Amino acid sequence: NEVSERVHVYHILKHIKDGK
């Protein structure tokens, strides 16, 4: 499913790069 796969990959990069 296109919605399920893309939301998962966007949250991993947003939390590590912006948060640290």
Residue 14 token pair: 């947003």
Mark out the alpha helices in 1-20 (DSSP H runs). Answer: 2-14
Q: Is 18 exposed, middle or buried (0-12, 13-18, 19+ CB in 10 A)?
A: exposed
Collapsing DSSP to helix, strand or coil, 1 comes out as coil
Distance of CA 13 to the CA centre of its chain: 5
* Residues, the chain: 20
Q: Is 16 exposed, middle or buried (0-12, 13-18, 19+ CB in 10 A)?
A: exposed
Tell me the C-alpha distance between 5 and 16, whole Å: 18
Residue 16 token pair: 């590590």
* Residue 15 to residues 1, 5, 11, Cα–Cα distance (Å): 23, 17, 6
